[PDB]
Each structure stands twice: as structure tokens, then as C-alpha cells.
Design a protein around this ligand. Structure first.
Ligand SMILES: Cc1cc(CCCCCCCOc2ccc(C3=NCCO3)cc2)on1
Ligand SMILES: Cc1cc(CCCCCCCOc2ccc(C3=NCCO3)cc2)on1
Ligand SMILES: Cc1cc(CCCCCCCOc2ccc(C3=NCCO3)cc2)on1
Ligand SMILES: Cc1cc(CCCCCCCOc2ccc(C3=NCCO3)cc2)on1
Ligand SMILES: *C(=O)CCCCCCCCCCCCC
Ligand SMILES: *C(=O)CCCCCCCCCCCCC
Lengths: 284, 178, 252, 61, 284, 252, 61
């Protein structure tokens, strides 16, 4: 009514070590058949004498919610306040999570993912170097607009599309706390796919790979009415923080360095690094 | 190494000198090249602290007709690693006999002064060595290959946990992709 | 099956996929000295896991012409970790043992060993009347060997195998705790020896309580296999070790 | 309707350690993270075998 | 449920003085044996006639929580907005509490300490002097990233490591309240050690002293996209305030001035200052 | 009287006819590691009487011009019987100690010693910035000595007595467990130190848990007596010693 | 679940002097300081002697 008792007063720990003494039996825990595709459930008490240890360690920091739940930079680009080239004055980004290596490797440890998304923007501006820099420009305001697939796309900073009568936009002024908002799980499927071993056409032709399922739309950003006498360059950095996460069918982590944003493509890389012989255990 | 797949094959042969060493490795699951890229090592590399026991499963892949006994041991840290089977047998070990059950599990216990060790392991946080020796020898009847391979699997036990989330040293970039 | 066996003492475990049973002393499991059987009054040390664990001695080769070997206890273990250390610092000691003799071959090899533990295996000299030194019968974990021919070297013990160095019939050694390793069925032998002596405790350097003998009754034989020798390894674990009369360590 | 639950333990020995939360938005997507669910099962991965296998008994036959 | 009664309506005071009159007895409180390693529990009433005094003084301000619980500057460094030298543009600090003398002396009054830590950052910027200073630079934003031991370290202001997909970072804009956050007790041991009389190697070789136990990681800080036409120098000051503190085995305070950041090293200093003779009690 | 004192650990007993009290750690009596405070999972050895007994180090001479001495633990006991042996074979160890410092003179002698146990007595080098080796602070049961003059030898620790090698005021060492031997009243000092560390167990070679310092605050003085020096002897007994992580012995 | 406790006395004579607190974070490390715990024991340091010594009676014999 007023207060509610969702208290988790009983939290999970790591397994205790049971005291274990000598044995002489036909029962043999240490011998198994790896061939079954089974990982052994052996513990020290099975193969040696152990003392009792009340273990209070907890796996709290390794839940998928926690592992994925930190904001990571997924994109960055610059847009000028004034320039002769129309395209240098605004950013148009096709939303995806494959261009920044760190976030990509983490998400890619799972095949399917389902989560809500917290998006934070970090926008900074700097005056371009030049011969004459004296000016007195008022504070800048930026507009970030999300255009769902199929909506009208802006062709220049001053076009009608920026009216956002229906698309969601954020107007933010410099000097303030970074802009932020939440987006729910928006896939047309039941989970987001990090990989897709298939084609776009029924023919088994067309696009191949996860890129065929990426149609989340674009993010467009411009200065509001910020034309300055001497150019100023703003850089926008977008951060993603998944929350209320669920993950399915885990995969080996990416070993080879990434080469392309929209394909699994790689260059063969060795299993691991080498040492002189199979018995080398020293450093020098 | 000529062929990459050879890295997974531990050589074992007939008429090996008595008490010969099969292999030796140092226990730094997140740092040593032998472990750093395994499932366990990859997970460890997103953290800075670790604690718990480990399972090293060995599977004999020779013919059903070959026989052999091996001594697999774990030596808690000290100034010097074991150089002889006599040295090794004083620590935690198991004597593996080959038969119908092809695999054997050496469970390396958590023996440490601190509750947690660093993934970026150092001397203070030293964990020791795991070594393998011929207990008897690999004997073979007529008409079977002269040498065979042993494989090693690794995983964490139920008392294992990691702490302190951090970025991994294993992935990087100089430019945005595209 | 029962052929499967697992034994854990201290920080060591032994496993066998093809065994016979486990022979236990004269049906007597090792045990600590009781108050009503003690004379030495000082509180004893019972190091437990530090001493009661498996120690593997140097291995040996069983060849077609091998004749037999012996190891005297506790001497054979005098250099083994804390067991040896405790032997040195104490006037009196007491212990039982789990003896595990290992020997694997193949389904195409043949051979048969007697694995026996002889209590008080007092031996005769190579030349009657001539005294020999301790070195003629024991020295750390060094395996001593019997011979077919009768021994001439007076610095040695009478090693002729058929009399087992004791003046008795070698085929009658079966009245002592034993097991057979017949290559056709076994791959190891396990004998648990309790403490056997005429006094409750004894000095561990001066008295060899029992001798382990491994004797090929049926010679090692095989056909065109690339394997030549078949190794034999002895692993033993002290049990219920306790010591009395602490003082300075004995130099050797 | 405020929810009151326990905090993750700090440097000091544990009652004063509970925090309170109230949701301000109409969409659940707006809510903070589920930092405190510790349900866990490693057996889909460590033992997906049809016939269950007890450690003491041998694996084959 | 709603309200909770953790009220400390009964707080501790300093001992009262009991009235005490004349005495003539065999019982002698003032004579003792300092040799036992015992400090006498004598009070004025034991050796003279006292009146009764209801003492309300309290030792509240001298609890260890209170003594250690004030923010103290533990480090400061400068980083430029623009410079030819790559390293002059960002700070890389190996976290420790031994470089600033005041905090160090306080912590070092105890051998072991266990506490949570509140960290506050004070960042200020100034335009470097020069011949031509006219420019109009927008507000600056800084990034402070914590790299746990072993994580990728940034080699320059613009490198990939600054993505922080997993390491914790703070983005802060000038003109606002100083940045701050709490860190829990993060030692791998049961308490932090201020001293360590030992070696890193089992050999009794290698590093000697507390420095061998210091592996808390680094703090890296840079301007976000702050390249300015004329250089601006920012100075970061980091403050530590321990909270929820516990301390064990107290030691004599440091008498000699500190000489090194990572060692106890000192130069012999006299016990105290001198006076002309053992009876001098005047000032002039 | 209470001056009379008798202490028995293992096969050794200490007696004193003129003592003060017995100082006990920070009011904490030595005790074995509990299950809820342990990390290392192997079953430990607790040798009991073999290790928990009194060991007497080499004696030293207190002369009119002596300035002070120190011994680092457990290093000082690394060669003492089975205590030293157990230190060598194990990665981890844990123990408390009963320290008994002996010093008898006569009713006509005068002098006063501070007997302190300093936990984590991390020391500074003779020349700041210059590293020294382990040998500059400990080596078996060898007593190290402080000096009046400030140390110049860079291979040494800064031995100037008034700063106790730690950069603090020597007269403030009293916050650590201590006792005074004032020749006029005492003849010995007994301090029981419990295990104090930031981790449950630790390696015994690599870490000196505490340092015993014996410092003459009032110089030894006497008249026309034929006795010249007054010996000082340190006898110490480990208490509740337990070890984990058995493996091969550390060479040194 | 708000906690209500007493304040440290001010210039004026003492009921109106209690303050209220509510924790907003999921980690106890985030909580404010324990400025008000006054438990205290000087005897580990002032008298660590095995045998207790009453002031009135002599120290030796
Ligand atoms: C980021 C990222 C990862 C991928 C794979 C895409 C996974 C997305 C899962 C479903 C998201 O919602 C959809 C929106 C549009 C489409 C679509 N498929 C054909 C082209 O557009 C499908 C799913 O590529 N970039
Ligand atoms: C494909 C795919 C799926 C994923 C995760 C990507 C999905 C991320 C959610 C999409 C978020 O897109 C935004 C929506 C709106 C706004 C925005 N609204 C107000 C102004 O900006 C910004 C981002 O991994 N692979
Ligand atoms: C600050 C400061 C004080 C010190 C002493 C360090 C005390 C820290 C206590 C434990 C902190 O957590 C650890 C992290 C890593 C290591 C480590 N030891 C070997 C190298 O890294 C040990 C403890 O030196 N700098
Ligand atoms: C060693 C030692 C231990 C101590 C106290 C030092 C420990 C201080 C805690 C370590 C704090 O480190 C930080 C962690 C993260 C951040 C940070 N996170 C968000 C961005 O900055 C900053 C400091 O005394 N000696
Ligand atoms: C839940 O609302 C039941 C109890 C009401 C508590 C009062 C709320 C305190 C003020 C915050 C209101 C939130 C409005 C966005
Ligand atoms: C504790 O919560 C029980 C009583 C609820 C009091 C209402 C809280 C007042 C508004 C603050 C909410 C805190 C959300 C961060």
C-alpha cells in the first residue's frame, strides 16, 4: 500500500568445501568419460583430504545483467556549425552495435539477446583553429532525432523533416547533464539476433548474415540555429547500456580481430601464443 | 608449431625413460598462454580478481590396446618448481590408470593466502605449477601405433567466482569499422 | 566392477582400472597405539596428512631375465618428506602402510609376480660366518636384487632367489600377506600392512620391521612388440604414524 | 507504493542496510536495472545427457 | 515499515569525578610496576581530595570514522587541451595513498584498515599565456576512467580504450558540482595493509615493503573532444574520504619527514626539540 | 607470590622466580583458524607437541655500551627442529608465540630494557632510495643490532636507535605489546603474541609478521663486581601452528 | 523505510532534535558515514596482562 517488502534477505553464495578424510573404495569419482559431452562435477573433497570452509563468496558481479549493464560507446562522429559542404553539418547514423569493437565482442558472446536500452549522449564542441578566432557565440543547442525505418530523412540542416511531429527528438543545450532516455525491446522478432546464418532471398541469394536483420532505423543530429561566424566542430558520442536483460545460447568469444562492421569476416589467427617447450614454466 | 591443431595434442610414447616428464604448466588461468584463450580464460579476462578450484580433465586418445599409468600433480607456490617426479609427488596429485574410463580429473584446490588472486597475476598472487610424469610407461602389444595423444580440458568448480569487471586486453581497433 | 579402485590419503589419490582385491595384514587394519598398550609416557605427535600420504619410489625395469627385488621398511622411506623428517627427530616411531605395486603390460604379454611383505626378514650373508653392513640390504629407496646364481661376494647378502635370502623355500612365502600380479588379469597389487612387532613402538632406523619382495614366478614374455621392458613402480603411504622421544635429528 | 529491499553488503558488518525505490515512469523500460537477481543453473551446459550420471559410479558400462 | 527507530537516545560520555575525602590506609593506588606493560588506571580521586563533577564531555569527534572521514587531496596533475607531446594531453595515475603527506600520516597511524571509499574530483582549467589569446571555446567536458589491473591502457587521447564498454568512467562538464562516487572495500585481502614487512618472492628477494601489495589499478583522464586553437591547461585534484571504517593495530605517528612515495625510507630525526636545562620552564 | 611462574609447552618447561605479569597480545590468546575465516581448502597439519614447544636462540651480551637488538619472526625460527621443517615443506603457515626474554643481574646492578613485538616492522634503508637485501635484516637466529650513530653503509638498514629503523619516535614503541625488564625488579619478560595479519594465513619465508626488539632505555651499570657482561637469552614457543599447501621443501 | 535518529546536540537545550534518512542506492558502499558509533575499549592497549590487577593492592608479590 505504502511500503512493499521486495527484500532479498536470502542471497546465493558459492559452494562450501566439506571436510573429507581418507578413503579406500570401489567408488571412483576422478575417472570419467569426457566422450559423453559431460563436464565432471568433481570437487577437491573427491580427490584429496579437505578441511571444512564456509565460503561467503558470491557470483553477483557476473550475472548477464551486470556484465552487459554498463554504458559503452557505440558510435561517434563530427558535425560542423558552418561549412560549405551540406553533409559536414549534420550526422546520419544507421543504428547498429557492430562498429565499436568492445561492446560488439560482449554482445556477441550470446546468440540471442532481449533487453531494454538506456541511451546516453555525450556532445562536446570546439572552435576550429584559424587566423581570426575572435567571436562571441551564445550557448549551442542540439537536436537528436530518431527516424524509424521508412520515415522522411533530412537532406540538410534546415529541412522540413526536423519538425518531428511524430518521430522522437531530444533538444539539449550545452553545459548541462548529458541527454538520456530509455527505449524498450523493439525487435519484430522475439529476441535480437547477433548472428544470422542465412540469406535475405528465399532463393538463398541476396544479403548474407546478420546485416540482413538490421533495420532499427537512423539517428540524425544537427545544431539548432547554430550558424557561427567562424566554424565550431561538435562531436557526438552515443552510449548504449542494456537493462532488463535475457541472453540465450552462449558462443566462444571472438578470437580474430574484427575487419568489417557488417560481416563476420576475419583473418586466420593462431589458437594462442607459444613457449619454447611443453615443460617451460619459468619466465626468463 | 607447424600445424595449429598440434597445440591440443600432448605426446606420449613407448619406451619412455623411467619417471619422464610429460608436460609442465604454470597456473595463471587468466594470464598464461596455455589458458588465456580457453572459455575459462576468456571469461576471466573481463575481470580483475578470481577465486576457486579448477578441473583439469585428461583424456587418453590412443588405441584400446595401449596401457599406462601417469602421475599428475599440483605444486602450491614456493621458490622452485618441481624438476623431478620425486619432487612432484610430494604435492597434491592423482595416479591415473588407463582402462575403459578414458578420462581422469585432477582437481586443483584453492590453496592461497588471500581470498582472491589477480587475473593479471603477479608473484605475490602466485598459484603454482601442474606437472605430469610417467608413473610406469605406455606399453603396447604388437600391431599398434608407437605414440599417442592425450588431451586436456579445463573448467571451473562450484566454489569459483570472479570480481571487478574490466575491459579485456584481447580486442582492439585503430578505426571505426566501415 | 570391483576391479575399479580409488584410495585417498592426505593430498594424494591412487586409482586402478584392473585390480584384484585389497589384502589387509592378518585381517588387521592399522591403528594408533592405545593407552593400555603404551610404555613411553610423553605425548606423541601424529602429523596426520603431512606424513600419512602416498610416496612414489624410483621405478625399475622388469625384463625377460629379471629375477626379483626387495625393499626394506621403514628405511625405504627415510628421505620421503615429513615422514623422513619425523623419523630423524624421534627416538621412537610406529606406523602401518598401504603398499600399491603398479605394473601394466598388454593383453599380449604374459608374466606373474608375487608381491609379499615379510615381517622380520632377517637375512644370511653371502659367505657363512662373514658379517656384512647395512648397505648390503637397504639404502633409501634403492631396489635391491636377487640373483639366480649363488652369491660369492662376501660384502653381500646371500641373494640366490630360490631361498629368498632367508634359508627357506621361496614357494612358501605365501604365508605372509601377499597378492599376485598376473599380467593376464591384474595391473597392480595393494596390501595394507598393520604395525607388527614384539614391542609397542621401536626405533625406525635401527629396525627394519618388514621387507617388500617382488618376485617374478613366471618370466616376462612377449612377441614382436616395440615395447621392451615393463616398468614396475611402488607407491606407499604410512598410516597412523606416531612418534615419541623428540630430540636432535639423527645425522643420516 | 514504494519498494524496500536489501543492499549489497559494504565494508561494515550488517538492520540499517535496505534502500527504497519508487518508479516515476509509465513504461517498465524506464526502470533501473535488475542488478540483484542471482538465479543460476549451469547444467544445460555442463550436463545435457539424457541419462543422469552420479559421480561415484563409473561412466561407461 | 514506514518509519524506523534507530535512535541513539543514550550516548556515551567521559568519566565523572567522584567526591573523595581523606584516607589513611595500607591500600596504595599510586605505587605500581610499569614493568608489567600495564598503564595505570588511576584518577585524581585516588591521590587527592576531589569534589563531585558531572562530566558531560564526549569523545564523539575522535572516533576513527570521524578522524579519517574528511576528504583529503591524494593526487594532482595537469593535462593540456593541445600540445605536441602526446603525454602532456592526458593523465595516467597508479592509484595509491602515499604521495600526499597529510593523508599518508593519518592512515599510517594504523597497520590495517578496512573501509569504503568516497572519491571526489576537483577539475579546473586555465588558458595558457601567449601572444595571441583571442578565442571563443565552448564548455569543456572531461572523462575519468578507472582501469582495473590488466585492462588495456590508453596510449593517447584518441585511442580505442576510451570506449569503456566495461571499465567505469565519469563524463563531467565544467561549471557543475564536482564529480563524485563511492567504491566499496576492494582489497583481495581482508583488510588494506599500510605496511608490509616482506618480499614479493618466496626467495626473500624482489620488491620489499608495502609497495608489493599495491595493485589497485590506474585512473586515466582526458578532455573529451576539447582540442582548442590556443592551449588550455586543466588540473585534476583527487580527494579520498574513507567511510564505514575499521582500523587495527595502531602505530606511533611518523616522526621523520617522508622522502619516497613507495618506501618507508627516512633520514634520522631527533626525538624532539631541546631547552637549556632540565629545569627551564620560562619562555624568555 | 605471583612473581613465581611456570610454563609448559610440549616437552619443555620454563620457570621464573622474579617476574612481572604475562602480557597477552592485544588481549588475544593464540587460536587455530576457524572454518568461517579460511580460504585454503586442504586439510592442514597441526604437528602439536613437535612444533609447539620452547626453542632457545643463541645468547647475546648486554654491555655498558650496548644500544639495542632485533630479531624478525618467523625467520628467527627457520632452523628450529620440526618447526623449521614444516615451514620449508609448506606454502602457507600460521602461528602465535610465547616469547620469554631472560636477563638476570644482581641487587647491585642497574639497567632497564624495553621488550616489544612490532607487527609489520617495515624498515628504511641506510641511504634513502638504495635497496638492501634480506640479509640486512634477518638471517636465522642471528641478533641484529641498532647503533647510536646514523648508518652510512648502504647495504644496511637505517640502524640509528632513536628512530627504531621505522622513522618513528623510539619512546612511542609502547603502543605495541611490551614489557620492561628493570634489573631492580624483573629478571625476565613474557609476551604471548597471537597471529596478526591482513590475510588468514601467509607464507612464512616471504613475510616477517613481527619483529622482537630489546632496547636498553637505561644503560647497564655496576660497580666493583667481577662480573662484566650480563647475558640476554630469548626462548620462544610457537602456538597453534598449522600449515597448508604441502609440496617439496624450499632449498633455504 | 525511513530511519529516524537523534542529532548531535547544538547551542540550545534539548523533542525536536531528530533527523530522518532514506537510502537511495543498491550498494551499502553508497551510504553516508557512521559518524555516531561511540563504542570504545582502551584495555587491549592499557592493560593486556594475563592476570587482572586491582588498583588498591600492590603490583609485585
Ligand atoms: C546492431 C546489429 C546487429 C545486427 C543483427 C540484427 C538483429 C536485430 C534483431 C531484430 C531487430 O528488429 C528488426 C528490424 C528490421 C528487420 C529487418 N530485416 C530485414 C531488413 O530489416 C528485422 C528485425 O546487425 N547490426
Ligand atoms: C540489431 C541489434 C539489436 C541490438 C541492439 C540494438 C538495438 C538498440 C535499440 C535501438 C535504439 O535506437 C534509438 C531509438 C531512439 C533514440 C532517440 N529517441 C529520442 C532521441 O533519440 C535513439 C536510439 O544488437 N543487434
Ligand atoms: C596506497 C598504498 C598503500 C600500499 C600498500 C597496499 C595495501 C593494499 C591492500 C590490498 C589491496 O588489494 C590488492 C591488490 C593487488 C595486490 C597485489 N599484490 C602483489 C601485486 O599486486 C594485493 C592486494 O601501497 N600504496
Ligand atoms: C593500497 C592501499 C589501500 C588504501 C586505500 C586505497 C584504496 C582506494 C580505493 C581505490 C579507489 O580507486 C578508484 C576506483 C574507481 C574510480 C572511478 N570510478 C568511476 C571513475 O573513477 C576512481 C578511484 O591504502 N593503501
Ligand atoms: C507509493 O507511491 C506509495 C507511497 C507514496 C509515497 C510518497 C511519494 C514521495 C514523493 C515522490 C512522488 C513521485 C511522483 C513522480
Ligand atoms: C521507506 O521508503 C518507507 C517509507 C516511504 C517514504 C517515501 C519516500 C519519499 C520519497 C523518496 C523516495 C526515494 C526514491 C529514490
Amino acid at each position: 500500500g505504502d511500503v512493499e517488502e521486495a527484500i532479498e534477505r536470502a542471497v546465493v553464495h558459492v559452494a562450501d568445501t566439506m571436510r573429507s578424510g581418507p578413503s579406500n573404495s570401489a567408488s571412483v569419482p576422478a575417472l570419467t568419460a569426457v566422450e559423453t559431452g559431460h563436464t565432471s562435477q568433481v570437487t577437491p573433497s573427491d580427490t584429496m583430504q579437505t578441511r571444512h570452509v564456509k565460503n561467503y563468496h558470491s557470483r553477483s558481479e557476473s550475472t548477464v545483467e551486470n556484465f552487459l549493464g554498463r554504458s559503452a560507446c557505440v558510435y561517434m562522429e563530427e558535425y560542423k556549425t558552418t561549412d560549405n559542404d551540406v553533409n559536414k553539418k549534420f550526422v546520419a547514423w544507421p543504428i547498429n552495435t557492430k562498429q565499436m569493437v568492445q561492446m560488439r565482442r560482449k554482445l556477441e558472446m550470446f546468440t540471442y539477446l532481449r533487453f531494454d536500452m538506456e541511451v546516453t549522449f555525450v556532445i562536446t564542441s570546439r572552435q576550429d583553429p584559424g587566423t581570426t578566432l575572435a567571436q562571441d557565440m551564445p550557448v549551442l543547442t542540439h537536436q537528436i532525432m530518431y527516424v524509424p525505418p521508412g520515415g522522411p530523412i533530412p537532406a540538410k540542416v534546415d529541412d522540413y523533416a526536423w519538425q518531428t511531429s511524430t518521430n522522437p527528438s531530444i533538444f539539449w543545450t550545452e553545459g548541462n547533464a548529458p541527454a538520456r532516455m530509455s527505449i524498450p525491446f523493439i525487435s519484430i522478432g522475439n529476441a535480437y539476433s547477433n548472428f544470422y546464418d542465412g540469406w535475405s532471398n528465399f532463393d538463398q541469394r541476396g544479403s548474407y548474415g546478420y546485416n540482413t536483420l538490421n533495420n532499427l532505423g537512423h539517428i540524425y543530429v544537427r545544431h539548432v540555429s547554430g550558424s557561427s561566424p567562424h566554424p565550431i566542430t561538435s562531436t557526438i558520442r552515443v552510449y548504449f547500456k542494456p537493462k532488463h536483460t535475457r541472453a540465450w545460447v552462449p558462443r566462444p568469444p571472438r578470437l580474430c580481430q574484427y575487419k568489417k562492421a557488417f560481416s563476420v569476416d576475419f583473418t586466420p589467427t593462431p589458437i594462442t601464443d607459444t613457449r619454447k617447450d611443453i615443460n617451460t614454466v619459468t619466465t626468463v | 608449431t607447424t600445424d595449429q591443431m598440434e597445440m591440443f595434442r600432448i605426446p606420449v610414447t613407448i619406451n619412455a625413460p623411467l619417471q619422464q616428464q610429460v608436460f609442465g604448466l604454470r597456473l595463471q588461468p587468466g594470464l598464461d598462454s596455455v589458458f588465456k584463450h580457453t572459455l575459462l580464460g576468456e571469461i576471466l579476462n573481463y575481470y580483475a580478481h578470481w577465486s576457486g578450484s579448477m578441473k583439469l580433465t585428461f583424456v587418453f586418445c590412443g588405441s584400446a590396446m595401449a596401457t599406462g599409468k601417469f602421475l599428475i600433480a599440483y605444486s602450491p607456490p614456493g621458490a622452485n618448481p618441481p624438476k623431478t617426479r620425486k619432487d612432484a609427488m610430494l604435492g597434491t596429485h592423482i595416479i591415473w590408470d588407463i582402462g575403459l574410463q578414458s578420462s581422469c580429473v585432477l582437481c586443483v584446490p584453492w590453496i592461497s593466502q588471500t581470498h582472491y588472486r589477480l587475473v593479471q597475476q603477479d608473484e605475490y598472487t602466485s598459484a603454482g605449477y601442474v606437472t605430469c610424469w610417467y608413473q610406469t610407461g605406455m606399453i603396447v602389444p604388437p600391431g599398434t601405433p608407437n605414440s599417442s595423444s592425450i588431451m586436456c580440458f579445463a573448467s571451473a568448480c562450484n566454489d569459483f567466482s570472479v570480481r571487478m569487471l574490466r575491459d579485456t586486453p584481447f580486442i582492439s581497433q585503430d578505426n571505426k569499422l566501415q | 566392477s570391483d576391479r575399479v579402485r580409488s584410495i585417498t590419503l592426505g593430498n594424494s589419490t591412487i586409482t586402478t582400472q584392473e585390480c584384484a582385491n585389497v589384502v589387509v595384514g592378518y585381517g588387521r587394519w592399522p591403528t594408533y597405539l592405545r593407552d593400555d598398550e603404551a610404555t613411553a609416557e610423553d605425548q606423541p605427535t601424529q602429523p596426520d596428512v603431512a606424513t600419512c600420504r602416498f610416496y612414489t619410489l624410483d621405478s625399475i625395469k622388469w625384463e625377460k631375465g629379471s629375477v626379483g627385488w626387495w625393499w626394506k621398511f621403514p628405511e625405504a622411506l627415510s628421505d620421503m618428506g615429513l615422514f623422513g623428517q619425523n623419523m630423524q627427530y624421534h627416538y621412537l616411531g610406529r606406523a602401518g602402510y598401504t603398499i600399491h605395486v603398479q605394473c601394466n603390460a598388454s593383453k599380449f604379454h604374459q608374466g606373474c609376480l608375487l608381491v609379499v611383505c615379510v615381517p622380520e626378514a632377517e637375512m644370511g650373508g653371502a659367505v657363512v660366518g662373514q658379517a656384512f653392513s647395512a648397505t648390503a640390504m637397504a639404502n633409501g629407496d634403492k631396489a635391491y636384487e636377487f640373483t639366480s646364481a649363488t652369491q660369492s661376494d662376501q660384502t653381500k647378502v646371500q641373494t640366490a632367489i630360490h631361498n629368498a635370502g632367508m634359508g627357506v623355500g621361496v614357494g612358501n612365502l605365501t604365508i605372509y600377506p601377499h597378492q599376485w600380479i598376473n599380467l593376464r588379469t591384474n595391473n597392480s597389487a595393494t596390501i595394507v600392512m598393520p604395525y607388527i612387532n614384539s614391542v609397542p613402538m621401536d626405533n625406525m632406523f635401527r629396525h627394519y620391521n618388514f621387507t617388500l619382495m617382488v618376485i617374478p614366478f613366471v618370466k616376462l614374455d612377449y612377441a614382436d612388440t616395440a615395447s621392451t621392458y615393463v616398468p614396475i613402480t611402488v607407491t606407499v603411504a604410512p598410516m597412523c604414524a606416531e612418534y615419541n622421544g623428540l630430540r636432535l635429528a639423527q645425522a643420516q | 507504493g514504494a519498494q524496500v529491499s536489501t543492499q549489497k553488503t559494504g565494508a561494515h558488518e550488517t538492520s540499517i542496510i535496505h534502500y527504497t525505490n519508487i518508479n516515476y515512469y509509465k513504461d517498465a523500460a524506464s526502470n533501473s536495472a535488475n542488478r540483484q537477481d542471482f538465479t543460476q543453473d549451469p547444467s544445460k551446459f555442463t550436463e545435457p545427457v539424457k541419462d543422469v550420471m552420479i559421480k561415484s559410479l563409473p561412466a561407461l558400462n
